[model samples]
Target: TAQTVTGAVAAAQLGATLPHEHVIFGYPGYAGDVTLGPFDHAAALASCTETARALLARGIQTVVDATPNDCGRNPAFLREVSEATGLQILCATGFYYEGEGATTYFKFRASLGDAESEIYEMMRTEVTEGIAGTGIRAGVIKLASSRDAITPYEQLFFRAAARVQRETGVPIITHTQEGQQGPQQAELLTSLGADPARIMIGHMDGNTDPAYHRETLRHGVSIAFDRIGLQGMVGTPTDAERLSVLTTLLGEGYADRLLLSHDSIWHWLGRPPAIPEAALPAVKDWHPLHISDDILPDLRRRGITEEQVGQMTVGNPARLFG
Candidate 1:
């Protein structure tokens, strides 16, 4: 069964899943200045319920909420959203990458030489027991690496998450910065005995090169084009470029190993960034519905069959979680 915020359900019930997204998110330091963007629970509920309804309208049944614990991961909030929309929401149990994540506390713990075991225990308990006294268990372990290399800080989390997966039977999803270190992430996790089928290297759309994709896929793990619709942010390529790479991979018979999602944050935990008027067009489609409204349709136009689409949207998620 796949654990949802409401409760656990059979993996087959997670139809048309988006393997990565954020219901509400803030950067590492958002909590320090709550007045700048206080989390108005009622208002956030209303807004996020609307976003969840929109996803339901588009046939998205399950959303893997990849908001890590330090990044405003509220299991109670996620439970309310699931209760409101009938959406199967899977929360994450892990932290973000070293560069942007709340790492100071863990760094201090590492100095005491107990960081790895502590992280493993935290993740294992959250998956097997519950999160922070809430009975909502997380369904996946989220880990991330920095650009160009997996730093020592990230390796600690990677090792911990892999051990948690081994003990809890939970799947692992990852953040690969700007499409880098995906193969390295796969190598490390598998080396630590995590199943390749249970691993997904995310943000791969940041790199448009098919060779890079092939290298990761060759490691027997899945990859996510989860940052769909964010064309230029962080130097991400155009949707057309993403589409071309996807088509090439599908042609090479990697459909079952591909998961599609838009890593769009429905609610910001802090003051949202001010985008310049000139850059407004870049993020116009950066929402949860972009895949249903645009990407899938375009894939059909390119002769991608419904079966192939099903594999990425439904089959793979069930397999990964099951």
Candidate 2:
């Protein structure tokens, strides 16, 4: 059961923490669509400083970097970002979404380091021991997997992730493809001994269907429509579209299972993805409170009760996280 959650998010102390967001992780060449896709080390570091500072001012308490390995992650830089900005940052160390996942383990596995044990040790050190020499400690374990079909390598990664969860009391957070289809994969993990309730399944906003959300929740898992304020990247639906799903599920008495986040980040002005990210016709402002600014406040205007809003943003997350 601990697999569904891990540690207090860095932002948990900040105030209103959004459980998932990426500081930086570019595949050696991410989004091949752009070519400039991954690892501009300097730029990534710069983004850390700028983004963390921005979130801090907006009353963000913590941020979970959903960036798993193969995504060009640099925890040292990420940690420094937190230290500098007076923000708390929780990082991920595991497989990534899509077919790109194998790179995280195979290379290490092929080199004679037991991939599973090594992953456990790394997580153990971060959660139980200490991160590097900083002693900052990581509060969560991040795991990512693609849809289309789960690769053999990904299965191996999950087995290892489950082992880490078993050994450490830390909770596991998940990254899913498109959205709304993690019930079976989650079942596979729990069947293999991972706890479903300790997990938070993302991309739920990508689909309108709540049967899957209900199914996962029935398993004691928490679902985050993390892309709420992203407007519509990765086919992320609009807040109104999301509200339909939220309203339906919450109205049906499933409020306790729902968690919400805008999944908004500080994007560079020049990044190509920025075009789509910034062009989201739905998001009218550039703020982490976009959920409040452009979405919730509007709902208040449209007759959404303050108590209902409290359930989604403030109260529901508090309960899931606790």
Candidate 3:
């Protein structure tokens, strides 16, 4: 039987909320070029512990480490980090960003055993037994959809997540390919009987179009403005740019549906940049969240009230994750 938990706990909080961010996930699989990233588990673990303590000091209560299974989510190590820092972590499970790297193991049909059972095992442990036999718990499910359209492997993952959520009553967190057709993905999951409100469409700000962003919220689903570390890949929004969009969205009364996270994973050793040509100069390009250090101040400068900031950075996500 799975070890079900009652109260909500997480890795880091928004001083009084939840931050939609990450701590680890630099493995040989996620790096595109060998020179670009490396899998230093020791370093990654240390980084996680340090990061967790930092967030805790800031009064953060929970952190959503959206490092899915395919991306090398180390629940055991995360457990260690949690013990050291005393911050609750809500780890994710499901497929990661689409590409050969995230799903390469599924390339051959013979490898189904590993992925199929592994997916359910993640759910069973998280929902029934607690992650890695630790007493910690997860309140959500994480899945990814490709921009090219959902693939076969993604379909399988979707089915598993839907089943897990149905069986365990956890909300679903989805990663869309830079905010494309997010409505379609939401519809897909809801059609599978998942609750629309509980589903979070991550990377909602991946596109520059306000129409798409607004439409996603119109569907009664939460939207995550992820992609903090890919300013070059996802396009950087200045404090003004970010604030401008945020003001309009909040004005439209979608504040509760919006969530923000730096999505800072430090680096991906095997990955391609998500930047487009018409954007910043190649060298000037940085992770969109390269400067998350200023995000809170930026919100304050833009006149976003502390309460609203709480809704976007903490309350909203806390509700969804639960």
Candidate 1 residue lDDT tens string, 1-322: 9998999899878999999999999998888879877888899899999989999998999999999888999999999999999999999999899879999999999998889999999998899999999888999999999997999888988999988888777999989998799889988888899889999999999888999999988889999999999988887888989999999999999999999998999989888778897778788899999999999989999899999999999999999975
Q: In candidate 3, which residue ranges exceed 4 Å CA deviation?
A: 1-19, 27-42, 100-122, 130-138, 234-240, 266-293
Better-scoring candidate (lDDT), 1 or 2: 1
List TM-scores for all candidates, in order. Answer: 0.98, 0.78, 0.78
Q: How far is candidate 1 from the true structure (C-alpha RMSD, Å)?
A: 0.9
Please state the error at residue 56 of candidate 1 in Å: 1.0
Model 2 over residues 1-322: C-alpha lDDT tens digits?
Answer: 1111222443233345667776654544545535543346567667667766766676665666666655545567667677667676666666675465537447557368566666667767766656566655556677766766556656666777777767764667777777735786677678877666566777777777878677777767777877776555566666778878877786787665566665555442224354444474655542455664566677677666777766656554454343
- Give, for candidate 3, the lowest lDDT window spanning 10 residues: 1-10
Quote the lDDT for 8 in model 1.
88
The 10 consecutive residues of candidate 1 with the worst lDDT sum are: 272-281
**Candidate 1 runs further than 4 Å off:** none
lDDT of 1: 0.91
Root-mean-square deviation of each candidate, in angstroms? 0.9, 4.7, 5.0
